[PDB]
Write a protein that holds these residues in place. Sequence first.
Motif, PDB file in Angstrom:
ATOM      1  N   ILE A  59      -5.444  -8.389-132.734  1.00 31.13           N
ATOM      2  CA  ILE A  59      -4.428  -7.783-133.578  1.00 31.13           C
ATOM      3  C   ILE A  59      -4.628  -8.099-135.048  1.00 31.13           C
ATOM      4  O   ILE A  59      -4.414  -9.227-135.469  1.00 31.13           O
TER       5      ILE A  59
ATOM      6  N   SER B  27      -6.950 -10.310-124.070  1.00 33.43           N
ATOM      7  CA  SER B  27      -6.289  -9.107-124.547  1.00 33.43           C
ATOM      8  C   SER B  27      -7.054  -8.552-125.760  1.00 33.43           C
ATOM      9  O   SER B  27      -8.177  -8.964-126.026  1.00 33.43           O
TER      10      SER B  27
ATOM     11  N   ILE C 154       3.851  -2.823-132.497  1.00 31.33           N
ATOM     12  CA  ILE C 154       3.255  -4.026-133.050  1.00 31.33           C
ATOM     13  C   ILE C 154       2.976  -3.946-134.543  1.00 31.33           C
ATOM     14  O   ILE C 154       2.295  -3.029-135.002  1.00 31.33           O
TER      15      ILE C 154
ATOM     16  N   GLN D 138      -4.069 -13.000-131.306  1.00 25.12           N
ATOM     17  CA  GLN D 138      -4.260 -12.381-129.990  1.00 25.12           C
ATOM     18  C   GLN D 138      -3.432 -13.050-128.897  1.00 25.12           C
ATOM     19  O   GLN D 138      -3.040 -14.213-129.037  1.00 25.12           O
TER      20      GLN D 138
ATOM     21  N   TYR E   6       1.258   1.016-131.693  1.00 27.85           N
ATOM     22  CA  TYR E   6       1.697   1.030-130.305  1.00 27.85           C
ATOM     23  C   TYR E   6       0.595   0.640-129.323  1.00 27.85           C
ATOM     24  O   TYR E   6      -0.535   1.134-129.396  1.00 27.85           O
ATOM     25  N   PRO E   7       0.907  -0.269-128.390  1.00 27.91           N
ATOM     26  CA  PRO E   7      -0.113  -0.666-127.416  1.00 27.91           C
ATOM     27  C   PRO E   7      -0.158   0.504-126.440  1.00 27.91           C
ATOM     28  O   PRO E   7       0.881   1.079-126.111  1.00 27.91           O
ATOM     29  N   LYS E   8      -1.345   0.874-125.982  1.00 28.44           N
ATOM     30  CA  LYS E   8      -1.443   2.006-125.074  1.00 28.44           C
ATOM     31  C   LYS E   8      -2.427   1.788-123.934  1.00 28.44           C
ATOM     32  O   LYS E   8      -3.635   1.704-124.146  1.00 28.44           O
ATOM     33  N   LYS E   9      -1.886   1.689-122.722  1.00 24.98           N
ATOM     34  CA  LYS E   9      -2.694   1.474-121.526  1.00 24.98           C
ATOM     35  C   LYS E   9      -3.782   2.532-121.382  1.00 24.98           C
ATOM     36  O   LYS E   9      -4.767   2.328-120.674  1.00 24.98           O
TER      37      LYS E   9
END
Lengths: 89, 90
Positions: free
Chosen positions: B77, B74, B24, B56, B14-17
Amino acid sequence: SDERFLCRSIRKLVYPKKGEYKQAIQIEECEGADQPCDFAANFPQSYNPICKQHYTQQTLASIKSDGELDVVQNSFKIPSCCKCALKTG
Amino acid sequence: DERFLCRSIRKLVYPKKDEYKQAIQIEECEGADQPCDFAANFPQSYNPICKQHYTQQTLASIKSDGELDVVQNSFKIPSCCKCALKTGLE
């Protein structure tokens, strides 16, 4: 160069059909899908080494109140990894 | 099941700010920089090591004069774990 890979593949950009910059998706496709990998002769023909194409998929997941995991995946596969596969165990 | 020269873990991250979050799909090497399996089957001048590959976010913009402007700011990955034959010195 100083690094060789068993499977020849191609990396490139693809643009999403459904949408000041554009976001392209990077993909990697097997140039020669399922053909033996370099140095295959060095392996018993038992496990015929061939180049396999792998994909990733857009994935949406939801975890319910009872903990059940519900996953939704885009029908479109994205070529992502071209690596050598051996028929072993 | 078919074996690979490098062990790796395919997993969801999970992408997390509707209530589905974006997860993902990633592939991590189980032992990056460690030797590939069956390394002895390759010419001894080579050094077969498991290598971690990444993809990426790639933003591109083509100016009016044809100049391409790329932004790749970014996070990386983990996407593929594969065997890299490091060429001997010579």
